[PDB]
């Protein structure tokens, strides 16, 4: 019953705003200080701000000390982060997590965490990728580049989903441009190169983007 | 900012017992804490106030903080126990997280990458672009380096490296991709992605034709 829950991330382009909030259940919200951690893609956990049970005290990271605000309504059991000039270095998932006291003490932990909201800070608009056919004993690495695409996600079958035991389709790279590339390979016998056709199927639903490419030596 | 300096990663074999430490100047006059992060999930507490447990913590996690260092030891380390683990402290009222240990709990024999790297097509070359696709697979433990060469010279510039993700199988693939124009691509004599895990390095190399 004891939970917390984050809402109001979403994709933002750089110098805009964004308000998160963090509702409380199963305790008494007010009786506890509520802070927030964040965790870039693939990195550790960095803290961002901090609030004491009633409110007065405010804490807030070197990062973000200007640019954002912390507060609470504990009438309405909720914590609020307003977040304005948003750099792409704040792309993070927010988590709100409950301290063990009123406020940041010595041997204070965070005994609740929640599950997270995700904030993109990026100025890429939706585009659909670019596929170009890569080619190079028994077998053959045959593969489909799809290029500078956005948002996430991309779909890749070979010969309409035919060919898949001997396929790998690699996660995505995030490149400084905010786009992304994706790459898939399958594994085919060379001796049946020029005889047999591959053909991969690339659909990317946020551009309304298909294509098959036509993979050959 | 005090920084609390971990090690980036930790081996354990199941059974065995996990050391992370924690090091920092204004620790050991002040309290450490140790959370535990598993794939995809919040955070967890497993020990606070340097070596107390709360109440639902296993036993086997217990801490110390020494000095200037904080050590989080994991007794009988058990394959759930693999997560990144962060130690953390107060600065008066601003919180500090450490660097953050990647825990593997080696769950499989080593296996070195397979390394398949692909030229820029010619219909890339005709819209005057040029990628390199260097893709990478089937390596555990899951921690990789990639570096390029031109004509064995090295090259940071047009690079964009993925981090390892865990395949079905429970061994990790990356990928690297370096950007090239036509021009640069024609005139060198070749172009490496070398890739480093465990202190092998597997290098494959394309070049214009």
């Known amino acids: 019953e004891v939970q917390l829950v984050e809402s109001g991330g979403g994709l933002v382009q750089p110098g805009g705003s964004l308000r998160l909030s963090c509702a409380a259940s199963g305790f008494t919200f007010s009786s506890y200080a509520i802070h927030w951690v964040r965790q870039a893609p693939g990195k550790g956990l960095e803290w961002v701000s901090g609030?004491?049970?009633?409110?007065?005290?405010?804490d807030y990271a070197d990062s973000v000390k200007g640019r954002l605000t912390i507060s609470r309504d504990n009438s309405k059991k909720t914590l609020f982060l307003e977040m304005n000039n948003l750099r792409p270095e704040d792309t993070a998932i927010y988590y709100c997590?409950?301290?063990?006291?009123?406020?940041?003490?010595?041997?204070?932990?965070?005994?609740?965490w929640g599950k997270g909201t995700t904030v993109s800070v990026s100025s890429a608009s939706t585009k659909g990728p670019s596929v170009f056919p890569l080619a190079p004993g028994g077998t053959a690495a045959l593969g489909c580049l799809v290029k500078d695409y956005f948002p996430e996600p991309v779909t890749v079958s070979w010969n309409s989903g035919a060919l898949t035991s001997g396929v790998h389709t690699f996660p995505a790279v995030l490149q400084s441009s905010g786009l992304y590339s994706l790459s898939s390979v399958v594994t085919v016998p060379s001796s049946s190169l020029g005889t047999q056709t591959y053909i991969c199927n690339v659909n990317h639903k946020p551009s309304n983007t298909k294509v098959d490419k036509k993979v050959e030596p | 900012s005090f920084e609390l300096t971990q090690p980036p990663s930790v081996s354990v074999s199941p059974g065995q017992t996990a050391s992370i430490t924690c090091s920092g100047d204004?620790?050991?006059?002040?309290?450490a804490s140790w959370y535990q992060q598993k794939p995809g999930q919040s955070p967890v507490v497993v020990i606070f106030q340097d070596n107390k447990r709360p109440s639902g913590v296993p036993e086997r996690f217990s801490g110390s903080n020494s000095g200037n260092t904080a050590t989080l030891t994991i007794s009988g380390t058990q394959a759930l126990d693999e997560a990144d683990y962060y130690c953390?402290?107060?600065?008066?009222?601003?919180?500090?997280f450490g660097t953050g240990t990647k825990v593997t709990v080696l769950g499989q024999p080593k296996a070195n990458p397979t390394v398949t790297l692909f030229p820029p097509s010619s219909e890339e070359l005709q819209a005057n672009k040029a990628t390199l696709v260097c893709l990478i697979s089937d390596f555990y433990p899951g921690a990789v380096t990639v570096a390029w060469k031109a004509d064995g010279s090295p090259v940071k510039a047009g690079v964009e490296t993925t981090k390892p993700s865990k395949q079905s199988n429970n061994k990790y693939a990356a990928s690297s991709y370096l950007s090239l124009t036509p021009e640069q691509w024609k005139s060198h004599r070749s172009y490496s992605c070398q890739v480093t895990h465990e202190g092998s390095t597997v290098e494959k190399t394309v070049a214009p034709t």
């Open positions: 953390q402290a107060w600065d008066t009222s601003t919180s500090v």
């Open positions: 204004k620790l050991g006059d002040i309290y």
């Open positions: 609030l004491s049970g009633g409110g007065g005290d405010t």
């Open positions: 997590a409950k301290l063990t006291g009123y406020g940041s003490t010595p041997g204070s932990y965070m005994d609740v």
